[PDB]
Design a protein around this ligand. Structure first.
Ligand SMILES: [Mg+2]
Ligand SMILES: [Mg+2]
Ligand SMILES: [Mg+2]
Ligand SMILES: [Mg+2]
Ligand SMILES: [Mg+2]
Ligand SMILES: [Mg+2]
Ligand SMILES: [Mg+2]
Ligand SMILES: [Mg+2]
Ligand SMILES: [Mg+2]
Ligand SMILES: [Mg+2]
Ligand SMILES: [Mg+2]
Ligand SMILES: [Mg+2]
Ligand SMILES: [Mg+2]
Ligand SMILES: [Mg+2]
Ligand SMILES: [Mg+2]
Ligand SMILES: [Mg+2]
Ligand SMILES: [Mg+2]
Ligand SMILES: [Mg+2]
Ligand SMILES: [Mg+2]
Ligand SMILES: [Mg+2]
Ligand SMILES: [Mg+2]
Ligand SMILES: [Mg+2]
Ligand SMILES: [Mg+2]
Ligand SMILES: [Mg+2]
Ligand SMILES: [Mg+2]
Ligand SMILES: [Mg+2]
Ligand SMILES: [Mg+2]
Ligand SMILES: [Mg+2]
Ligand SMILES: [Mg+2]
Ligand SMILES: [Mg+2]
Ligand SMILES: [Mg+2]
Ligand SMILES: [Mg+2]
Ligand SMILES: [Mg+2]
Ligand SMILES: [Mg+2]
Ligand SMILES: [Mg+2]
Ligand SMILES: [Mg+2]
Ligand SMILES: [Mg+2]
Ligand SMILES: [Mg+2]
Ligand SMILES: [Mg+2]
Ligand SMILES: [Mg+2]
Ligand SMILES: [Mg+2]
Ligand SMILES: [Mg+2]
Ligand SMILES: [Mg+2]
Ligand SMILES: [Mg+2]
Ligand SMILES: [Mg+2]
Ligand SMILES: [Mg+2]
Ligand SMILES: [Mg+2]
Ligand SMILES: [Mg+2]
Ligand SMILES: [Mg+2]
Ligand SMILES: [Mg+2]
Ligand SMILES: [Mg+2]
Ligand SMILES: [Mg+2]
Ligand SMILES: [Mg+2]
Ligand SMILES: [Mg+2]
Ligand SMILES: [Mg+2]
Ligand SMILES: [Mg+2]
Ligand SMILES: [Mg+2]
Ligand SMILES: [Mg+2]
Ligand SMILES: [Mg+2]
Ligand SMILES: [Mg+2]
Ligand SMILES: [Mg+2]
Ligand SMILES: [Mg+2]
Ligand SMILES: [Mg+2]
Ligand SMILES: [Mg+2]
Ligand SMILES: [Mg+2]
Ligand SMILES: [Mg+2]
Ligand SMILES: [Mg+2]
Ligand SMILES: [Mg+2]
Ligand SMILES: [Mg+2]
Ligand SMILES: [Mg+2]
Ligand SMILES: [Mg+2]
Ligand SMILES: [Mg+2]
Ligand SMILES: [Mg+2]
Ligand SMILES: [Mg+2]
Ligand SMILES: [Mg+2]
Ligand SMILES: [Mg+2]
Ligand SMILES: [Mg+2]
Ligand SMILES: [Mg+2]
Ligand SMILES: [Mg+2]
Ligand SMILES: [Mg+2]
Ligand SMILES: [Mg+2]
Ligand SMILES: [Zn+2]
Lengths: 100, 84, 99, 138, 208, 125
RNA sequence: AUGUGGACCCGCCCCUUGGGGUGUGUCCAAAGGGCUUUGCCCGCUUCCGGAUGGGCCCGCGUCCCAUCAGCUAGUUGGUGGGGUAAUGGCCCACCAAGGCGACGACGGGUAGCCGGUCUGAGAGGAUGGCCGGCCACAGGGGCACUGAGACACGGGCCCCACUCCUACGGGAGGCAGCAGUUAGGAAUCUUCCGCAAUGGGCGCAAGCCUGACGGAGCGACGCCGCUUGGAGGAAGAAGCCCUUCGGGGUGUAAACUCCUGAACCCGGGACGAAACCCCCGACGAGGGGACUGACGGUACCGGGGUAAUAGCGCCGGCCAACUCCGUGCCAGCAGCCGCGGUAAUACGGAGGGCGCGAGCGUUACCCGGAUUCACUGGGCGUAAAGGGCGUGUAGGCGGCCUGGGGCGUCCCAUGUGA
């Protein structure tokens, strides 16, 4: 079966393309604590509908482009700029790690 | 073509083939798709030959091709004796 | 001092030119139809595309071009020549096209 | 605040026992409950009674022990020789029905939250489940 | 190859007769009778308390020195035993006893296992009609060990075969004295021979 | 620590430093003698131990110990290095194998001839 | 030229990311050779299937240094093109200004990955050598051609490095194939036999090729099996060790007496081989009949038949095995603790003893012991270890009740797990 994933949009700043942020929970191989992770995907929106916050689903697809192999499936829960902010501050805080 | 042939096993001076299907360009002890019975050419045991005779014809149906010394051990298993 | 199946390469030399020669003709002819289909002359155009079409497949039987390549050629070709003749042109013949 | 209430319960008992008291009061939950219960069903405790204290609900838990021994230190054996949290918020412990304890060779008892609830090693095996191992007791 | 030379030093040293010669180790004088004290210049001197290791050591060798085999062949059997079922230890004796050359000693075809071996090695012994010249053969139930034809006679068999008329051969054993043949019947339980050894310690030793 | 920390770092894996780096995972290493002399060991005792300074393959020049009683080593003498310090003499971390190359075995040694590169003598006649 | 049939543009049809169906228009096929010849066989061309082998893509997993913290111009997306068996920024235009990173980008160091393998109670740790699966390279690089298939070890062009031949008139080569040589190294073999068998290529088939393979050769390198004997044999010689000079030890050991008998000599002698082919039947099903063994006169079988190599380590404690002598902080031992200073069970030899045995030691390395990186399974008052003290970002963690969702988690079934 084609992979099915669920995540938040953080970028609409590409033409007819977007960036979906996927989480996953699971235990640590040795320490068993249940932990999270993240992967960004470049999702295809051939009709730039989806936008910032659109908690959506995407699906493994034939190579639309380099880096870009997921089409959007469907909206699930639009308007979630709260989750988006997490990704934002986290990337912001990166500046205060500049080895100076 | 794909084939059915003698894949050597056992030891030095102690042959013990494994009757098998694979690509004619695989190694003669290389990876195979499915084993169909054994063959000690030294008759050191009652069970010195065995086939899953159904599968044997199945691969033969689709287009397998045994050897000049693999049919002999399948002719000797009524694969060819085709009733009336 | 060596294998005399070096012919296999010398064989390639002929097969090289032979199938190369046909291949130049394919495009130089394919050239024509395109230019013409752009200058309204939809008559002489579809005389070439019809010739184009035959030139390809005729080599496709052999060992030159094969597979969906002829298709990929012919497609994008009449996918284009016709999409040029939209400039009035008038389908002077369906003599290539199932219009 | 209490990061873990379940641990706090167990720990409250363990503290109470080591001074040999009648009862041990502890904040209430429908999940702390069906966790205790077993401790009466397996007779580790006398039992409890849902009561209220200062307008707030608690669970007076009544402690079993053993015989007034003799010799110096006549203090009786405990019923509860040992009890400790396993799955924790710092590290949650889940197990398949196979991967399941043999606490003190049958003499001990694990306690787990499962798709059918607060089973034991013995039960969960027989119902064929396994789940979040809460604690071990003997 | 095997141990060769001074044997009677070993009925002693271990400090316990282990009947390793022919009739001598059975006759009034088995290297111990006269001198039941350890070999060498330091013989008639008072021993110091052994180490636990020392205790375990002596017990192992004893057993091996009894069956008289390489440390090579010996330990394989222990691990084999150590790997197997349940008791996975005491069973050991069963594996030791299944040795062809061992059996032949019990079957009284010879008197020393050393004498037994030279027979098997010279192939004067047969199994189920088969010329078997390998002293390591793990025999099993119902297998039959008999003198071959070229050797049914031989001065060395007759008297060695004869003198067996007296004693009840092992429960796991049987012998057509006239027919020159025997049957391995079963696996000798620990009961079936209280060897002068405490096999518990050999185990303890080998788990170094 | 705590478990969170364990994910953040893990536990560090010790590592193990060699004590025979002049060899490079080799059982031995051939060399050439530069100096051959005697030295005084750690106060603990006292004597005049025979050690050679050896220039080997890998440009290296290390002090190697000469064991037993007497030898046949002037300066330019091919040698073979073993491995194993002396403890008495600081700095020396390597032995010389006897009876190999220009260094020969111990004359009239009857016991531990496995070392000391001494061949078995004739006992009868 | 024929057109079953296929491809391409537009249409509707269903289906749905270029799948299927059809409408019209236009393009596409070829091959003959041999006969128990007038009939069959080996081939030819189109299409759909099947099966096998793949190409591309995706999720998750995969080393050390943060004393590498910022990286990026085809960079990221778009549009349209070029290209391929086909997706794609794979390449090219143009447009947009994006894409990545403390969940460790970028940089540096090491490494072919796995099934496995070694150790370990386990959890782990270590490792990838032979065998098997995949990737990668073929002197160093680049490139394409032919082709179903390669950018091709023993095919081709070019550049470089290197070596060789030559009347020098100029040209030639690519062992990481099999052996073998050199050099390097502590160290790794025969320039052997045969296609008899298995497998592979060609052919209708005989048959041909096969340093794949089947064997042989060299090396205690490893594992395993076996021998240098067995029974007897003294109150127990000689010699050699101690000795309180009475004796004790080596020691049933030898001798010696019987018995067997590794080797070697003679004879015989394989399995591994049954098919391809041949007869009848239709060369199919079938019975049937026939050739071939490199290893090799080898193993094994029979008879005859000879008592026939033993070494190495250790014997202060850990650690099993003790005494004379020599030596006198010397010569020397040593894995740690330490032995040697004129009485050394610790050096050296000797006798004796312990331990393995065609082996015994040593060195180097991996795991164990080490619960000494501690998930299982540890600590931080004085032993090494609480940040000098706040505030707080991300992050981790979260009280009491009832619902929905069932993400984690739990069960069953099934496929996969070679
Ligand atoms: Mg292949
Ligand atoms: Mg046949
Ligand atoms: Mg091509
Ligand atoms: Mg057992
Ligand atoms: Mg000193
Ligand atoms: Mg001093
Ligand atoms: Mg020494
Ligand atoms: Mg035509
Ligand atoms: Mg269609
Ligand atoms: Mg043709
Ligand atoms: Mg002709
Ligand atoms: Mg392929
Ligand atoms: Mg561009
Ligand atoms: Mg484009
Ligand atoms: Mg495109
Ligand atoms: Mg291609
Ligand atoms: Mg990430
Ligand atoms: Mg890091
Ligand atoms: Mg690098
Ligand atoms: Mg490498
Ligand atoms: Mg692994
Ligand atoms: Mg294991
Ligand atoms: Mg194991
Ligand atoms: Mg593991
Ligand atoms: Mg690994
Ligand atoms: Mg290696
Ligand atoms: Mg290799
Ligand atoms: Mg491999
Ligand atoms: Mg080279
Ligand atoms: Mg090639
Ligand atoms: Mg090439
Ligand atoms: Mg390649
Ligand atoms: Mg070559
Ligand atoms: Mg070579
Ligand atoms: Mg050299
Ligand atoms: Mg070589
Ligand atoms: Mg070889
Ligand atoms: Mg062949
Ligand atoms: Mg063949
Ligand atoms: Mg053929
Ligand atoms: Mg012919
Ligand atoms: Mg040839
Ligand atoms: Mg050849
Ligand atoms: Mg070979
Ligand atoms: Mg050998
Ligand atoms: Mg050696
Ligand atoms: Mg005596
Ligand atoms: Mg004497
Ligand atoms: Mg004797
Ligand atoms: Mg005789
Ligand atoms: Mg013969
Ligand atoms: Mg043939
Ligand atoms: Mg037949
Ligand atoms: Mg026949
Ligand atoms: Mg002969
Ligand atoms: Mg004979
Ligand atoms: Mg003799
Ligand atoms: Mg004799
Ligand atoms: Mg030792
Ligand atoms: Mg030891
Ligand atoms: Mg001792
Ligand atoms: Mg004296
Ligand atoms: Mg003196
Ligand atoms: Mg002295
Ligand atoms: Mg003194
Ligand atoms: Mg010592
Ligand atoms: Mg000494
Ligand atoms: Mg001695
Ligand atoms: Mg000695
Ligand atoms: Mg811990
Ligand atoms: Mg500690
Ligand atoms: Mg603390
Ligand atoms: Mg201090
Ligand atoms: Mg401190
Ligand atoms: Mg403080
Ligand atoms: Mg602070
Ligand atoms: Mg500060
Ligand atoms: Mg917070
Ligand atoms: Mg929370
Ligand atoms: Mg909560
Ligand atoms: Mg499964
Ligand atoms: Zn005796």
């Amino acid at each position: 079966p084609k992979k099915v994933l669920t995540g938040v949009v953080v970028s609409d700043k590409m033409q007819k393309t977007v960036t979906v942020l996927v989480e996953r929970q699971f235990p640590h191989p040795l320490y068993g604590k249940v932990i999270k992770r993240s992967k960004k995907y470049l999702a295809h929106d051939p009709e730039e509908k989806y936008k910032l916050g659109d908690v959506v689903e995407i699906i493994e697809s034939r190579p639309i482009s380099k880096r870009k192999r997921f089409r959007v499936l469907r909206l699930v829960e639009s308007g979630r700029m709260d989750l988006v902010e997490k990704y934002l501050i986290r990337r912001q805080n990166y500046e205060s790690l500049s080895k100076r | 073509m794909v084939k059915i042939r003698l894949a050597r096993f056992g030891s030095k001076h102690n042959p013990h083939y494994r009757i098998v299907v694979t690509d004619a360009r695989r190694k003669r002890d290389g990876k195979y798709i499915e084993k169909i019975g054994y063959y000690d050419p030294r008759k050191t045991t009652p069970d010195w030959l065995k086939v899953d005779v159904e599968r044997a014809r199945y691969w033969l149906s689709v287009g397998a091709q045994p050897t000049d010394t693999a049919r002999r051990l399948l002719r000797q298993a009524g694969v060819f004796r085709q009733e009336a | 001092r060596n294998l005399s199946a070096l012919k296999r390469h010398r064989q390639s030399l002929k097969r090289r030119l032979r199938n190369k020669a046909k291949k130049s003709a394919i495009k130089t002819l394919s050239k024509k139809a395109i230019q013409l289909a752009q200058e309204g002359k939809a008559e002489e155009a579809l005389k070439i595309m019809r010739k184009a079409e035959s030139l390809i497949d005729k080599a496709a039987k052999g060992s030159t071009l094969h597979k969906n390549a002829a298709a990929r050629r012919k497609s994008r070709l009449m996918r284009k020549v016709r999409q040029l003749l939209e400039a009035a042109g008038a389908p002077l013949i369906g003599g290539g096209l199932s219009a | 605040m209490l990061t873990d209430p379940i641990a706090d319960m167990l720990t409250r008992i363990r503290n109470a026992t080591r001074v040999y008291k009648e009862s041990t009061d502890v904040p209430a939950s429908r999940f702390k409950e069906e966790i205790l219960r077993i401790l009466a069903r397996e007779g580790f405790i006398k039992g409890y009674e849902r009561v209220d204290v200062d307008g707030k609900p608690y669970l007076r838990v009544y402690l079993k022990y053993g015989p007034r021994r003799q010799g110096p230190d006549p203090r009786p054996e405990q019923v509860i020789h040992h009890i400790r949290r396993i799955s924790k918020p710092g590290r949650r412990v889940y197990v398949g029905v196979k991967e399941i304890p043999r606490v003190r060779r049958g003499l001990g008892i694990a306690i787990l939250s499962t798709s059918k609830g607060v089973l034991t090693d013995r039960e969960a095996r027989k119902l064929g489940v396994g789940g979040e191992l809460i604690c071990e007791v003997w | 190859g095997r141990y060769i030379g001074p044997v009677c030093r070993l009925c002693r040293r271990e400090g316990v007769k282990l009947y390793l010669k022919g009739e001598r180790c059975y006759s009034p004088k088995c290297a111990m009778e006269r001198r039941p004290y350890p070999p060498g210049q330091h013989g008639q001197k008072r021993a110091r308390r052994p180490s636990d290791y020392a205790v375990r050591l002596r017990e192992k060798q004893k057993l091996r020195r009894i069956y008289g085999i390489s440390e090579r062949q010996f330990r394989n059997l222990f691990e084999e035993a150590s790997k197997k079922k349940g008791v996975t230890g005491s069973v050991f004796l069963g594996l030791l006893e299944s040795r062809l050359d061992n059996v032949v000693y019990r079957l009284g075809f010879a008197v020393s296992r050393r004498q037994a071996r030279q027979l098997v090695r010279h192939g004067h012994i047969t199994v189920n009609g088969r010329r078997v010249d390998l002293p390591s053969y793990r025999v099993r139930p119902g297998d039959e060990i008999a003198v071959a034809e070229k050797s049914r006679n031989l001065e060395l068999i007759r008297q060695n075969l004869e003198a067996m008329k007296g004693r009840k051969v092992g429960p796991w054993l049987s012998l057509d004295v006239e027919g020159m043949k025997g049957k391995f019947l079963r696996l000798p339980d620990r009961e079936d021979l209280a060897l002068p050894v405490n096999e518990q310690l050999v185990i303890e030793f080998y788990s170094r | 620590p705590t478990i969170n920390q364990l994910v953040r770092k893990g536990r560090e894996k010790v590592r193990k430093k060699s004590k025979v780096p002049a060899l490079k995972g080799a059982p031995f290493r051939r060399g050439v003698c530069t100096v051959v002399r005697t030295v005084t060991p750690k106060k603990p005792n006292s004597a005049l131990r025979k050690v050679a300074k050896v220039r080997l393959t890998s440009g290296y020049e290390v002090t190697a110990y000469i064991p037993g009683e007497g030898h046949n080593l002037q300066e330019h003498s091919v040698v073979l290095i073993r491995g194993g310090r002396v403890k008495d003499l600081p700095g020396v971390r390597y032995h010389i194998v006897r009876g190999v190359y220009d260094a020969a075995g111990v004359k009239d040694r009857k016991k531990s001839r496995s070392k000391y590169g001494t061949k078995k003598p004739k006992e009868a006649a």
